Ligand binder design. Structure first.
Ligand code: H4G
Ligand code: H4G
Length: 186
C-alpha cells in the first residue's frame, strides 16, 4: 500500500538516536505526512507575526527540547500538539532523518510522522498564523524564485493563496519527497 511503501522507504534513512545525546542546544521538528485524495502531502505552519524568531515564515511544527521530553521525538510531538492540536495518538513517528546543524551550538532533529486521517488542525494563534498542506510531489517540480538563494512558491489551488517556502524547511521537504517518491512505477 501507499502508506506501507512510504514507511518502508523512510525506515531505510532512519538514523535513530545516534546523534541525540551530543551536548547541543536541541530542537526537534515534525515532518507531518497527510494522505488526502490518494496522494501524500506535507503539513506546514505559518509562524505567527507576533513571534520573535522568523515571524510569518513557513516552517514545520516543532521547538526546543525541554526537561519533560523522554527523547527528541517527544519534543517534536509536544510542540506539534501545542502549535496545531495534534495529539500523540494521531501520529505515528516513523523515523528520524539527518539532523541539521546551525549556529555552531544547535542541533535540529527532524522526525517524519504519519498523521491520522481524522486529524483536523486547530492552529494556536499565539504561535501559528496558518496551517496548510502541500502535495509531496510538488517538491520534485517546485516553482523556484531566486531572492542569491532559492525560494519555493506554492499556490494552493483551493483558494489561490501563495506561500513561500525556504531554507531548512524547503530542504527537508525535498529530502522527504525524494525518499518517498523516487523510483516508483506508475
Ligand atoms: O519552530 C518551529 C520548528 C523549528 C524550525 C527551525 C528551528 F531552527 C527550530 C525549530 F524548532 N516550528 C514552529 C514553531 C512555532 C510555530 N510554528 C512552527
Ligand atoms: O487543509 C488545510 C487548509 C485548507 C483547508 C481548506 C482549503 F480549501 C484550503 C486549505 F488550505 N489544513 C489542514 C489541517 C489539518 C489537516 N489537513 C489539512
Amino acid at each position: 500500500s501507499m502508506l506501507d511503501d512510504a514507511k518502508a522507504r523512510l525506515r531505510k534513512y532512519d538514523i535513530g538516536g545516534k546523534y541525540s545525546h551530543l551536548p547541543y542546544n536541541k530542537y526537534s521538528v515534525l515532518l507531518p505526512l497527510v494522505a488526502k485524495e490518494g496522494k501524500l502531502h506535507l503539513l506546514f505552519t505559518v509562524r505567527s507575526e507576533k513571534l520573535r524568531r522568523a515571524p510569518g515564515e513557513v516552517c514545520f511544527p516543532g521547538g526546543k527540547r525541554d526537561p519533560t521530553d523522554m527523547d527528541d521525538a517527544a519534543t517534536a510531538l509536544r510542540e506539534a500538539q501545542e502549535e496545531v492540536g495534534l495529539r500523540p495518538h494521531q501520529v505515528e513517528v516513523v523515523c528520524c532523518l539527518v539532523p541539521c546543524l546551525i549556529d555552531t551550538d544547535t542541533l535540529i532533529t527532524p522526525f517524519v510522522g504519519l498523521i491520522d486521517h481524522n486529524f483536523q488542525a486547530q492552529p494556536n494563534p499565539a504561535e501559528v498564523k496558518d496551517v496548510f498542506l502541500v502535495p509531496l510531489a510538488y517538491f520534485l517540480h517546485p516553482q523556484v524564485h531566486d531572492q542569491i538563494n532559492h525560494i519555493f512558491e506554492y499556490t494552493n489551488p483551493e483558494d489561490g493563496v501563495t506561500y513561500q517556502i525556504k531554507g531548512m524547511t524547503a530542504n527537508l521537504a525535498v529530502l522527504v519527497a525524494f525518499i518517498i517518491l523516487e523510483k516508483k512505477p506508475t
